[PDB]
Amino acid sequence: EQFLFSSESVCSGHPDKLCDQISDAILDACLEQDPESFVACETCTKTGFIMVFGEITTKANVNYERVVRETVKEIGYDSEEKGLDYKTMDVIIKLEQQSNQHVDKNVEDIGAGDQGMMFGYATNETKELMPLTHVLATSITRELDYIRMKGVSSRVGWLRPDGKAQVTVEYNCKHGVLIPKRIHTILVSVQHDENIENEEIREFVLENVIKKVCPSDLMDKETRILINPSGRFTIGGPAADAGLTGRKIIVDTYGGWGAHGGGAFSGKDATKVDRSGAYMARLVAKSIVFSGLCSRCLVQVSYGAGIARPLSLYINTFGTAKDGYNDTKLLEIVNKVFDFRPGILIKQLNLKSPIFKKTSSGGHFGRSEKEFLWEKPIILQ
Amino acid sequence: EQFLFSSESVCSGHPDKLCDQISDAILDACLEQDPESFVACETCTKTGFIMVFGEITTKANVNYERVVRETVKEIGYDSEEKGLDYKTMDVIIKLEQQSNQHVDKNVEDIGAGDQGMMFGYATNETKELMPLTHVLATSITRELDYIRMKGVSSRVGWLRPDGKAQVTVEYNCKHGVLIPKRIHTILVSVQHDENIENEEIREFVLENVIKKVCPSDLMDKETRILINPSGRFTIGGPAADAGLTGRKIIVDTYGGWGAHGGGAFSGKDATKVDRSGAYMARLVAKSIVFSGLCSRCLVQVSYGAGIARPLSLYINTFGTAKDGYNDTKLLEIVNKVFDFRPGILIKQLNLKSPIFKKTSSGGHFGRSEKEFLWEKPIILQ
Ligand SMILES: Nc1ncnc2c1ncn2[C@@H]1O[C@H](C[S@+](CC[C@@H](N)C(=O)O)Cc2ccccc2[N+](=O)[O-])[C@@H](O)[C@H]1O
Ligand SMILES: Nc1ncnc2c1ncn2[C@@H]1O[C@H](C[S@+](CC[C@@H](N)C(=O)O)Cc2ccccc2[N+](=O)[O-])[C@@H](O)[C@H]1O
Ligand SMILES: [Mg+2]
Ligand SMILES: [Mg+2]
C-alpha cells in the first residue's frame, strides 16, 4: 500500500502567475483607497504587451498602467531578452463598470454574487497542514524567487524570472492517514542568462534550493533529481508562452489533493464567493485537523446567486475521524461555529483589507502571514 | 451516511466557454489542413472585442478572424444588446510562432512537452460512468443550448446565449460506493430578452428542460427549484463579464469530483500532455470501472519536460476494488495494457484529427460521440 503522487509549482515570473499578481496588485490599489470596491480584474500577456480587462466599481483613483508597470518591474521583467520589458511593453486597459444587474439589507442578508462551489482541504502531513508534495514544490519556487528578487548578491545574477518545479513523494496509507515515506523525484526548470551553462545551474539549485528546503531524512541516493532536463531555458516569460489570470488554480490551492470548484482567486474582491468561500472552507478544514478530530479533511460549500445561506455544505474526513466523531457530527459542529453567509464571511476574515497581493504567488494556503486569518485555526470539540 | 454535493455547468454563450470554443475552432482549422500543427491558442473577451493570442506553428493557411466571427455567430451573439455582436466586434490576432527550446527519434521516444500532472476519474453512478451531479448540470446547459441554437422556433426566440446551472444531489456512501438518493436543489440562471417575464421563464425551463433531463424518480416535492433567483438576466455575455480560455476546467472535467492537475484543454493540440494525458487518464479510469474491477477510480499521471515515460502513475479505487484486486495489482495491470508515452498516446487516441471543437462545450468526458476514443472502454482483468 505504497504509492507515488506529484504536485507542482511555478515561479513568480511564470506568465500566468505574472497575470495573477498584476490582477491582485490592482485589487489592492482599489481597496487601499476604497474598501467597498467591486473588482473583477483579469490580466493577459504575450510578447510585448499586457492587457487588464474586466469590471471595477470603485471610488479609488488608481493609475492602473502605473500599477502594471511597477508590478512587472518588481518581478524582474526589465528587458526584451528576458521575455518582457516593463519600460517598453504596451499596457492596454479595458476596464468598465460592473453590470447593473433596492430593499434595505443587514450584513446577514447579503446574497452570494454568483452560484458555485468551493472546497477546503487540510492534512496533518506537514506543520502547515498541507500536502507534502505541494509544500515542497511551492518551497522550491518560493526560494528561487526570494534569492533572485530580494537576495544579496550576484550569487544569482544569471537567474531569470520564469520557472517551474514538480515534486513526487512516495507515500504509505495506514487507515486513511497519509504518511510520506520518501521524496521520489524532484524536477526543477529555471530560466537563465546565455552565459551560464546547465552544469553550474544544477549545482546551484541542488545545494542552495533543493537541499535547503527539502528535509534530508526524506531524500536518499535513489531520489531522482532533474534540473532543466529539456535543455536550455534562456527564452521565457510572455515572449515564449502566453499568460492569463486564473490559469494556476491548482498551484494556488492543494497541488492535486483535495478538490476544486473551478473559480480563480486573483483579481477578485471578497464579495466573489469563489475566493471568500474557498478561504472560509480552508479555515474550517484546517480547524478540524488542528483540533485533532481527524487527520485529513475536505469541505465543500456551494452557493446560489442572490442567496445568503449556502445551498449546501459537505465534510469528508476520509475515514480518519477520531473515536466518537463522524462526518455527520462534524457537520453539525461546523454549523454551530462557522457562518458561510458571504457578508459574515467577509467581516470575519477581514477581507476588505488590501492584503491580496501577497497571496498571488506562493499559494493561498499553508501560509504563515499574520494577515491571513483563514490559516489561524479554531479549536473545535 | 448521507451528504449533499453540487456540481455546475455553463451555457455555450458563457463568456469563458465562448473563449474555449473559439480556441478549439482555431485548433481544428489548423489540424484540418496540417495534422502536425502545434497550437496553443488563447482567447479573451470583454465588451466589443475578442482577442486571440498565443503560439501556433503550422503550414495551415487559416483566416483567424473569419473563424472567430463564424464561431461567435453560431453561438448566437448577433447584437450588442445580447452582450456581443459578431458583425461589429473587433477581433484582434496576436499569434506567434512556438518558442525554439536535435537527434532522430521514434514515436516511443518523443518527450513530454512540459511537466505537469493529469487526473482521470470514473464512477458507476451513471451510464456515462460520470458523477450524477455533473451529468445533470451539464444536461441542463446542453439542452438549453440545443433548444436555442439547433431547434429554434419563436417558441424560444426569447432565450439569449449566456446562462449557468447547478445541481445538488443527496447521496448515500457505502464502502466508497456512491448511491444517489434524490436531487436536492436545481438552480438555473438563463439570459433572456427584455419582453419576457421571469414567471414564463420558470415554467418553460421547468417543463422543457429540467423535467426533460432529470430522472423523475430522483425528484420529489421537496426538491428545491431555483430559476433566475437573483433577478432579471437581460445583460450578459462579454458585456457583463470578461471571458478567457481555460477558466472552466472543472466544468470541462468532473464537477468537483475526482481531482485536477490544473491544465486547460481548449486551444491546445495533443502534444500538450495537459490535454492528451487527461484524456488517456479518463480512458484508464473508465476501463477499470467498466470492467467491473471497482465502482469508482482516480488515476494520476505526471510528466517531466523532455521526458517520454511518465515520472509517476497512481490509481485509487476508494476501497471499492473487487475481490482479488487492489490498487497495487491494478497499477500493474494498467502498466501492462496502457502506454502513457505522449507519441503513443496521440496515435492510440487519434488526437491529430480535427475533433476538438465538439469537446469545448458540454464537458470533455462522459460523451458518446464516436470520435472520442477516450470514452470507449477496454475490458481489463
Ligand atoms: N526552455 C524551457 N525549458 C523548460 N521549461 C520551459 C522552457 N520554456 C518555457 N518553459 C516553461 O513552460 C511553461 C509552459 S510552455 C507551454 C507551451 C506552449 N505555450 C507552446 O506553444 O507549446 C511549455 C514548455 C516546457 C518546456 C520547454 C519548452 C516549453 N515551451 O517552449 O513552450 C512556460 O510558461 C515556462 O514556465
Ligand atoms: N443577471 C444575471 N443573473 C444571473 N447570472 C448572471 C447574470 N448576469 C451574468 N450572470 C452569469 O454570471 C457569470 C459570472 S458574473 C461574474 C462577476 C464579475 N465579473 C463581477 O464583476 O462581479 C456574476 C453574476 C452572477 C449573477 C448575477 C449577476 C452577475 N454579474 O452581473 O456579475 C456571468 O458570466 C454569467 O454567466
Ligand atoms: Mg499557462
Ligand atoms: Mg469567469
JSON list of C-alpha atoms in Angstrom, two decimals, chain A residues 170-260:
[
{"chain": "A", "resi": 170, "resn": "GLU", "atom": "CA", "xyz": [6.28, 8.09, -2.16]},
{"chain": "A", "resi": 171, "resn": "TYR", "atom": "CA", "xyz": [3.56, 7.55, 0.46]},
{"chain": "A", "resi": 172, "resn": "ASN", "atom": "CA", "xyz": [2.15, 4.75, 2.66]},
{"chain": "A", "resi": 173, "resn": "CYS", "atom": "CA", "xyz": [-1.54, 4.71, 3.58]},
{"chain": "A", "resi": 174, "resn": "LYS", "atom": "CA", "xyz": [-2.34, 3.26, 7.05]},
{"chain": "A", "resi": 175, "resn": "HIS", "atom": "CA", "xyz": [-6.07, 3.58, 7.89]},
{"chain": "A", "resi": 176, "resn": "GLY", "atom": "CA", "xyz": [-6.56, 6.65, 5.53]},
{"chain": "A", "resi": 177, "resn": "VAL", "atom": "CA", "xyz": [-3.69, 8.52, 7.20]},
{"chain": "A", "resi": 178, "resn": "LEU", "atom": "CA", "xyz": [-1.08, 9.51, 4.66]},
{"chain": "A", "resi": 179, "resn": "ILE", "atom": "CA", "xyz": [2.46, 9.01, 5.80]},
{"chain": "A", "resi": 180, "resn": "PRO", "atom": "CA", "xyz": [5.18, 10.27, 3.49]},
{"chain": "A", "resi": 181, "resn": "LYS", "atom": "CA", "xyz": [7.93, 7.57, 3.16]},
{"chain": "A", "resi": 182, "resn": "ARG", "atom": "CA", "xyz": [10.48, 9.43, 0.85]},
{"chain": "A", "resi": 183, "resn": "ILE", "atom": "CA", "xyz": [10.89, 12.00, -1.87]},
{"chain": "A", "resi": 184, "resn": "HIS", "atom": "CA", "xyz": [10.90, 10.11, -5.12]},
{"chain": "A", "resi": 185, "resn": "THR", "atom": "CA", "xyz": [11.56, 12.70, -7.84]},
{"chain": "A", "resi": 186, "resn": "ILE", "atom": "CA", "xyz": [12.36, 16.42, -7.77]},
{"chain": "A", "resi": 187, "resn": "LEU", "atom": "CA", "xyz": [12.12, 18.35, -11.03]},
{"chain": "A", "resi": 188, "resn": "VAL", "atom": "CA", "xyz": [13.09, 21.98, -11.45]},
{"chain": "A", "resi": 189, "resn": "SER", "atom": "CA", "xyz": [13.18, 24.02, -14.61]},
{"chain": "A", "resi": 190, "resn": "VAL", "atom": "CA", "xyz": [14.62, 27.61, -14.26]},
{"chain": "A", "resi": 191, "resn": "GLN", "atom": "CA", "xyz": [15.13, 30.36, -16.80]},
{"chain": "A", "resi": 192, "resn": "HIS", "atom": "CA", "xyz": [18.78, 31.61, -17.07]},
{"chain": "A", "resi": 193, "resn": "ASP", "atom": "CA", "xyz": [21.16, 34.05, -18.94]},
{"chain": "A", "resi": 194, "resn": "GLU", "atom": "CA", "xyz": [23.10, 32.94, -22.01]},
{"chain": "A", "resi": 195, "resn": "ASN", "atom": "CA", "xyz": [26.45, 32.99, -20.24]},
{"chain": "A", "resi": 196, "resn": "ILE", "atom": "CA", "xyz": [25.78, 30.20, -17.70]},
{"chain": "A", "resi": 197, "resn": "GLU", "atom": "CA", "xyz": [25.66, 26.55, -18.57]},
{"chain": "A", "resi": 198, "resn": "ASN", "atom": "CA", "xyz": [23.37, 23.78, -17.32]},
{"chain": "A", "resi": 199, "resn": "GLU", "atom": "CA", "xyz": [26.01, 22.04, -15.13]},
{"chain": "A", "resi": 200, "resn": "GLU", "atom": "CA", "xyz": [26.53, 25.16, -12.99]},
{"chain": "A", "resi": 201, "resn": "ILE", "atom": "CA", "xyz": [22.73, 25.52, -12.68]},
{"chain": "A", "resi": 202, "resn": "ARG", "atom": "CA", "xyz": [22.34, 22.01, -11.29]},
{"chain": "A", "resi": 203, "resn": "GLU", "atom": "CA", "xyz": [24.95, 22.53, -8.71]},
{"chain": "A", "resi": 204, "resn": "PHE", "atom": "CA", "xyz": [23.42, 25.77, -7.53]},
{"chain": "A", "resi": 205, "resn": "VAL", "atom": "CA", "xyz": [19.81, 24.50, -7.41]},
{"chain": "A", "resi": 206, "resn": "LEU", "atom": "CA", "xyz": [20.72, 21.23, -5.62]},
{"chain": "A", "resi": 207, "resn": "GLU", "atom": "CA", "xyz": [22.77, 22.85, -2.96]},
{"chain": "A", "resi": 208, "resn": "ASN", "atom": "CA", "xyz": [21.15, 26.20, -2.38]},
{"chain": "A", "resi": 209, "resn": "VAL", "atom": "CA", "xyz": [17.49, 25.37, -3.03]},
{"chain": "A", "resi": 210, "resn": "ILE", "atom": "CA", "xyz": [16.64, 21.71, -3.03]},
{"chain": "A", "resi": 211, "resn": "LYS", "atom": "CA", "xyz": [18.82, 20.78, -0.05]},
{"chain": "A", "resi": 212, "resn": "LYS", "atom": "CA", "xyz": [17.79, 23.97, 1.72]},
{"chain": "A", "resi": 213, "resn": "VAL", "atom": "CA", "xyz": [14.02, 23.31, 1.60]},
{"chain": "A", "resi": 214, "resn": "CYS", "atom": "CA", "xyz": [13.57, 19.54, 1.33]},
{"chain": "A", "resi": 215, "resn": "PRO", "atom": "CA", "xyz": [14.14, 17.53, 4.51]},
{"chain": "A", "resi": 216, "resn": "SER", "atom": "CA", "xyz": [17.21, 15.38, 4.43]},
{"chain": "A", "resi": 217, "resn": "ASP", "atom": "CA", "xyz": [15.58, 12.45, 6.05]},
{"chain": "A", "resi": 218, "resn": "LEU", "atom": "CA", "xyz": [13.16, 12.15, 3.06]},
{"chain": "A", "resi": 219, "resn": "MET", "atom": "CA", "xyz": [15.95, 12.02, 0.48]},
{"chain": "A", "resi": 220, "resn": "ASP", "atom": "CA", "xyz": [18.22, 9.17, -0.38]},
{"chain": "A", "resi": 221, "resn": "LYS", "atom": "CA", "xyz": [20.59, 8.14, -3.06]},
{"chain": "A", "resi": 222, "resn": "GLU", "atom": "CA", "xyz": [17.70, 6.95, -5.28]},
{"chain": "A", "resi": 223, "resn": "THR", "atom": "CA", "xyz": [15.85, 10.27, -5.13]},
{"chain": "A", "resi": 224, "resn": "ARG", "atom": "CA", "xyz": [15.80, 11.36, -8.78]},
{"chain": "A", "resi": 225, "resn": "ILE", "atom": "CA", "xyz": [16.85, 14.97, -9.37]},
{"chain": "A", "resi": 226, "resn": "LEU", "atom": "CA", "xyz": [16.05, 16.52, -12.64]},
{"chain": "A", "resi": 227, "resn": "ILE", "atom": "CA", "xyz": [17.20, 20.02, -13.43]},
{"chain": "A", "resi": 228, "resn": "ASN", "atom": "CA", "xyz": [16.42, 21.75, -16.75]},
{"chain": "A", "resi": 229, "resn": "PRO", "atom": "CA", "xyz": [16.01, 18.30, -18.32]},
{"chain": "A", "resi": 230, "resn": "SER", "atom": "CA", "xyz": [14.52, 19.53, -21.57]},
{"chain": "A", "resi": 231, "resn": "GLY", "atom": "CA", "xyz": [17.69, 21.60, -22.18]},
{"chain": "A", "resi": 232, "resn": "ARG", "atom": "CA", "xyz": [18.34, 25.31, -22.29]},
{"chain": "A", "resi": 233, "resn": "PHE", "atom": "CA", "xyz": [15.87, 27.81, -20.86]},
{"chain": "A", "resi": 234, "resn": "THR", "atom": "CA", "xyz": [17.03, 31.29, -21.86]},
{"chain": "A", "resi": 235, "resn": "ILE", "atom": "CA", "xyz": [13.88, 32.31, -23.80]},
{"chain": "A", "resi": 236, "resn": "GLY", "atom": "CA", "xyz": [10.95, 32.63, -21.34]},
{"chain": "A", "resi": 237, "resn": "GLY", "atom": "CA", "xyz": [8.17, 34.74, -19.92]},
{"chain": "A", "resi": 238, "resn": "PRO", "atom": "CA", "xyz": [5.46, 36.05, -22.22]},
{"chain": "A", "resi": 239, "resn": "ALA", "atom": "CA", "xyz": [7.73, 36.00, -25.18]},
{"chain": "A", "resi": 240, "resn": "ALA", "atom": "CA", "xyz": [7.65, 32.17, -25.08]},
{"chain": "A", "resi": 241, "resn": "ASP", "atom": "CA", "xyz": [4.23, 31.48, -23.59]},
{"chain": "A", "resi": 242, "resn": "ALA", "atom": "CA", "xyz": [1.04, 33.49, -23.16]},
{"chain": "A", "resi": 243, "resn": "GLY", "atom": "CA", "xyz": [-0.21, 34.11, -19.63]},
{"chain": "A", "resi": 244, "resn": "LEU", "atom": "CA", "xyz": [-3.69, 34.72, -18.19]},
{"chain": "A", "resi": 245, "resn": "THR", "atom": "CA", "xyz": [-5.13, 35.28, -14.76]},
{"chain": "A", "resi": 246, "resn": "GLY", "atom": "CA", "xyz": [-6.73, 32.23, -13.22]},
{"chain": "A", "resi": 247, "resn": "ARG", "atom": "CA", "xyz": [-4.76, 29.50, -15.02]},
{"chain": "A", "resi": 248, "resn": "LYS", "atom": "CA", "xyz": [-2.86, 28.29, -11.89]},
{"chain": "A", "resi": 249, "resn": "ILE", "atom": "CA", "xyz": [-5.79, 27.31, -9.62]},
{"chain": "A", "resi": 250, "resn": "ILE", "atom": "CA", "xyz": [-4.27, 24.07, -8.53]},
{"chain": "A", "resi": 251, "resn": "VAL", "atom": "CA", "xyz": [-0.85, 25.63, -7.72]},
{"chain": "A", "resi": 252, "resn": "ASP", "atom": "CA", "xyz": [-2.92, 28.28, -5.85]},
{"chain": "A", "resi": 253, "resn": "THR", "atom": "CA", "xyz": [-4.56, 25.60, -3.78]},
{"chain": "A", "resi": 254, "resn": "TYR", "atom": "CA", "xyz": [-3.82, 21.95, -2.99]},
{"chain": "A", "resi": 255, "resn": "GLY", "atom": "CA", "xyz": [-1.49, 20.56, -5.73]},
{"chain": "A", "resi": 256, "resn": "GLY", "atom": "CA", "xyz": [-3.95, 17.91, -6.90]},
{"chain": "A", "resi": 257, "resn": "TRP", "atom": "CA", "xyz": [-5.07, 16.80, -3.43]},
{"chain": "A", "resi": 258, "resn": "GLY", "atom": "CA", "xyz": [-8.47, 17.80, -2.27]},
{"chain": "A", "resi": 259, "resn": "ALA", "atom": "CA", "xyz": [-10.72, 19.20, -4.94]},
{"chain": "A", "resi": 260, "resn": "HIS", "atom": "CA", "xyz": [-11.50, 22.45, -6.67]}
]
